[model samples]
Target chain A: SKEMQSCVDECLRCYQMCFGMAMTHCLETGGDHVKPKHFRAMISCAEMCRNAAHMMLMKSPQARHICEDCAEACEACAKECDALPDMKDCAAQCRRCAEACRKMAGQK
Target chain B: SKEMQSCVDECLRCYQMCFGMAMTHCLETGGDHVKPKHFRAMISCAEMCRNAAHMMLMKSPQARHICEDCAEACEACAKECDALPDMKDCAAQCRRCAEACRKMAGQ
Candidate 1:
């Protein structure tokens, strides 16, 4: 359904924000923003979100679990970006994506 | 650094294997080979492995952790292909990629 596709689009946007900002955040802060584990979490979140979209496009049954996991990652990222005022946009998108994914997960 | 790059290359290849064979497996078996969760697992593994390689190229702080997750996915994909005689090549690549990712993850 188009609704599912919309959910996928949400994840795709979240993936881009997480990936691009993960690098920029580190460069700007030169601090824990680049911490190994934290940085990895951002990357993983991006990947999971991307694949979640992929499953939704393919109409795969696994979209539920993908959405489930992506929601968790996006929520965590929303928390991580709390300290970076410049990251407000990304954080907001993450929250949006998380809610969208949670809905998708329940639907599928 | 070159070795790390090589590890990424392995992941790229594995990603192709898993993603490509995923559809083929479903087409050939017309059975549970295309099971929703299992199918999504292949797709997810492919994406994770690809991003792990991206992290290596980007010189991101998370390369090691990316490798760690990629290795786990590759290993699982490798095991998943055990029943498909035609999937031997993909399975082999998955194992190879898993090993490379594991070593890189540790390094």
Candidate 2:
């Protein structure tokens, strides 16, 4: 239960970080930051994280599957963010959320 | 593009309706409204719809799969809300979203 809660918190934090950064930081930063591939990855990661958190909050039986998807999305987004400049914070949050989601996915 | 955008709009509307009603109306209404099954369904529907919209916005190849899942969640949530009094608005929105999602999934 505590683990689930922690994972949920991580997911929500990642969701906000990715979404906010994509809309603001990436938008203003331009160049590689707003590239279609990278931008889409960030948005996808945010959506997956948000859905994962909500699923866990509702204690849905599908949370495990959602977490699996979220983990993959976060991992991909983290890598993309890590490659860019001025994106360390978003990348770090995405990595943390990815690890949490990976663990959550492994649980029953 | 227009169809995808329309589906996204529907999903967003449903997300707001279901999540808002669950947190406000359902919480205050009590009784069957707060029942774990129904309440969870509404929350699940909201989350699914939101995710579906985001997926489409980014033109994710997985949007079709997410839309399929969203349609199911919306359909189930609509049924649950339809059974309760004063939940017509939420139910109606869910149904509309479900139809839109189903179409999107088929696309």
Best by DockQ: 2
**Positional deviation of residue B70's Cα in model 2 after best superposition, in angstroms:** 1.0
Worst 10 residues of 1 chain A by lDDT: A58-67
Which parts of model 1 have CA positions greater than 4 angstroms off?
Answer: A1-13, A16-48, A52-87, A95-108, B24-41
| Residue A30 lDDT in candidate 2 | 92
Top candidate (TM-score): 2
Q: What residue pairs clash in candidate 2, if any at all?
A: none
lDDT of 2 by residue, B36-105 (tens): 8998898888888888887898797568877887888888888888888799999999999989998878
lDDT of 1 by residue, A1-108 (tens): 766878978999988998888877665786777876567667777876886787678665445765777788788778877776577788799899999998878873
Q: What are the per-residue Cα lDDT tens digits for candidate 1 across B1-107?
A: 87797897898888888877786766677576776656666777787777677768767655676677678777877777777677688779989999999888887
Candidate 1 chain B lowest-lDDT run of ten: B58-67
TM-score of B-chain for each predicted structure, in order:
0.88, 0.96
Over 4 Å off, model 2: A16-28, A85-96, B20-28, B85-93
